[PDB]
Design an enzyme around this catalytic site. Sequence first.
Site, mmCIF file in Angstrom:
data_model
loop_
_atom_site.group_PDB
_atom_site.id
_atom_site.type_symbol
_atom_site.label_atom_id
_atom_site.label_comp_id
_atom_site.label_asym_id
_atom_site.label_seq_id
_atom_site.Cartn_x
_atom_site.Cartn_y
_atom_site.Cartn_z
ATOM 1 N N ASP A 116 -0.161 -5.844 2.976
ATOM 2 C CA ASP A 116 -1.121 -6.907 3.302
ATOM 3 C C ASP A 116 -0.496 -8.246 2.853
ATOM 4 O O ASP A 116 -0.087 -8.353 1.686
ATOM 5 C CB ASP A 116 -2.445 -6.679 2.641
ATOM 6 C CG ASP A 116 -3.089 -5.333 2.839
ATOM 7 O OD1 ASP A 116 -3.110 -4.803 3.947
ATOM 8 O OD2 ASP A 116 -3.651 -4.807 1.867
ATOM 9 N N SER B 13 2.371 0.445 4.636
ATOM 10 C CA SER B 13 1.931 -0.881 5.064
ATOM 11 C C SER B 13 1.799 -1.844 3.888
ATOM 12 O O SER B 13 1.657 -1.391 2.725
ATOM 13 C CB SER B 13 0.616 -0.762 5.819
ATOM 14 O OG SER B 13 -0.496 -0.789 4.993
ATOM 15 N N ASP C 166 0.592 3.671 1.833
ATOM 16 C CA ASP C 166 0.728 4.140 3.217
ATOM 17 C C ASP C 166 1.917 3.584 3.972
ATOM 18 O O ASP C 166 2.157 3.908 5.181
ATOM 19 C CB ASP C 166 -0.616 4.018 3.939
ATOM 20 C CG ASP C 166 -0.881 2.606 4.435
ATOM 21 O OD1 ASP C 166 -0.200 1.653 4.064
ATOM 22 O OD2 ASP C 166 -1.786 2.480 5.261
ATOM 23 N N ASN D 124 0.859 -1.217 0.000
ATOM 24 C CA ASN D 124 0.000 0.000 0.000
ATOM 25 C C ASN D 124 0.884 1.252 0.000
ATOM 26 O O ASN D 124 2.016 1.219 0.453
ATOM 27 C CB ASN D 124 -0.912 -0.029 1.225
ATOM 28 C CG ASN D 124 -1.788 -1.237 1.350
ATOM 29 O OD1 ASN D 124 -2.605 -1.481 0.440
ATOM 30 N ND2 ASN D 124 -1.664 -2.035 2.425
ATOM 31 N N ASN E 33 -2.602 -7.052 7.497
ATOM 32 C CA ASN E 33 -1.882 -5.799 7.348
ATOM 33 C C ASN E 33 -0.765 -5.631 8.383
ATOM 34 O O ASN E 33 -0.867 -5.930 9.546
ATOM 35 C CB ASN E 33 -2.932 -4.666 7.354
ATOM 36 C CG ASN E 33 -2.261 -3.336 7.018
ATOM 37 O OD1 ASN E 33 -1.919 -2.546 7.907
ATOM 38 N ND2 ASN E 33 -2.033 -3.052 5.754
#
EC number: 3.2.1.17
Length: 129
Positions: free
Chosen positions: A52, A50, A48, A46, A59
């Site tokens: 998954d 982070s 951000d 992601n 996450n």
Amino acid sequence: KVFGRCELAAAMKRHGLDNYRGYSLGNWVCAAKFESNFNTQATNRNTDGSTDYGILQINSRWWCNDGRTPGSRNLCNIPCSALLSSDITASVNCAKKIVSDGNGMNAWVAWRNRCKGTDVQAWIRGCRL
């Protein structure tokens, strides 16, 4: 590893997910289907910071440590890499924790959007269990 529907159902059942906190096995199969398409190696990176990880796309901000995510809590107490294994044990142990840490199956966007409200019992119909 890419699981078959019935194979994953069986494995999940041996790991005690049928009726864990009131969620029938079919909800768990359905979540994995739409999170990862049954792929234990699925990863989603992601914007951000982070990532998954794995068959249920857990996450890195809250649940596992990958050493590269800001605000890391590592609530399952495991390296994110344990979630990319052909064996589903670590993923199952962390999913139970997520549901135990005040979240329902709503912690899984794919569950909420594609499983919630449907006939999840379809996902295990015809399987040996």
